[PDB]
Design a protein around this ligand. Structure first.
Ligand SMILES: Nc1nc2c(ncn2[C@@H]2O[C@H](COP(=O)(O)OP(=O)(O)O)[C@@H](O)[C@H]2O)c(=O)[nH]1
Ligand SMILES: Nc1nc2c(ncn2[C@@H]2O[C@H](COP(=O)(O)OP(=O)(O)O)[C@@H](O)[C@H]2O)c(=O)[nH]1
Ligand code: NA
Ligand code: NA
Lengths: 168, 168
């Protein structure tokens, strides 16, 4: 039932920062007196209960056995790069292709995110990213976790993509 | 083929500290000229290629959709508590029971670890832990990631447990 979001992308692009910001304003204390302590947190986005996972192959998942399992379990993917990191943008295709392979489908809920849009030191232009998103058939959003710009929007977009996919 | 180790336990018991220490002295640069860049890191413990994963339900996996998948993929479990944290010891049974349930088996390679054995502020006695390990049928090891005591031993023990299990 819950929407399973997975944030993917190169290391140091702001996956953790984005997810923490989102959770900060979206967690609810859910009351259930038939469980220990009675109050578990859950994340609710655009009126949907969401589960959230970060696939971090640069850090926490470098020596991991779980990469393909994150991709099989995940329902929608936020593919993140940083606007000051050309390599992180170049890495998007590899992640996208992986997910496509694992899920064995051309149609996966995905949103492309260019993070750190507050930085003056841009090397990835909006148009480059737009072209990429358009090739994939997916939305593109620029975000900044530092300044809190379009963070909720990116997650909201992905939720909506998953909602549309589920209606098929 | 590779040994899939999963470190489980309450938050702040030293799972990350233990795993980082282990990796520090066990990673090898593996040369393979048919791949990009030619040199991927791998972890080798007791002459076995290992993959390493931390299940952290207090942090990185609190809102996660992946708990049961970590347990299904994992082959051996390092169950960690801290000797100054009574609650973290009380939580071991819950983790153990979860893994048993997910894997549908009484026989899972497991090692019980009491971490932070360098601390003077003990509330879990060695005998308590020994009794627990003995009930489970598994080794118990006290460790300190801070002072670097028995860290390799704990992982070596779990590797050996997995080796024995695989020989069945
Ligand atoms: N200027 C700026 N820095 C950011 C932004 N998001 C994250 N960072 C920083 O980038 C680094 C990597 O962030 P982190 O969330 O750890 O990236 P992850 O490795 O992809 O999870 C940290 O220093 C963050 O503070 C952002 O939108 N703008
Ligand atoms: N004294 C002491 N502190 C430790 C030890 N291992 C970890 N810590 C500290 O305990 C805290 C939690 O460690 P961390 O690895 O983040 O725990 P995790 O949440 O289980 O991954 C940090 O402040 C670590 O530095 C240890 O063996 N001894
Ligand atoms: Na790493
Ligand atoms: Na958390």
């Amino acid at each position: 039932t819950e929407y399973k979001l997975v944030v993917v992308g190169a290391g140091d692009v702001g996956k953790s920062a984005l997810t923490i910001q989102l959770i900060q304003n979206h967690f609810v204390d859910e009351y259930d007196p038939t469980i220990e302590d009675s109050y578990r947190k859950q994340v609710v986005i655009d009126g949907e209960t969401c589960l959230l996972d970060i696939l971090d192959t640069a850090g926490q998942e470098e020596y991991s056995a779980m990469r393909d399992q994150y991709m099989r379990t995940g329902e929608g993917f936020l593919c993140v790069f940083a606007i000051n990191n050309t390599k992180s943008f170049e890495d998007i295709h590899h992640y996208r292709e992986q997910i496509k392979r694992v899920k064995d489908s051309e149609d996966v809920p995905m949103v492309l995110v260019g993070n750190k849009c507050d930085l003056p030191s841009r090397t990835v232009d909006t148009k480059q990213a737009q072209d990429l998103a358009r090739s994939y058939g997916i939305p593109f959003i620029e975000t900044s976790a530092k300044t809190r710009q379009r963070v909720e929007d990116a997650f909201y977009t992905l939720v909506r993509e998953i909602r549309q996919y589920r209606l098929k």
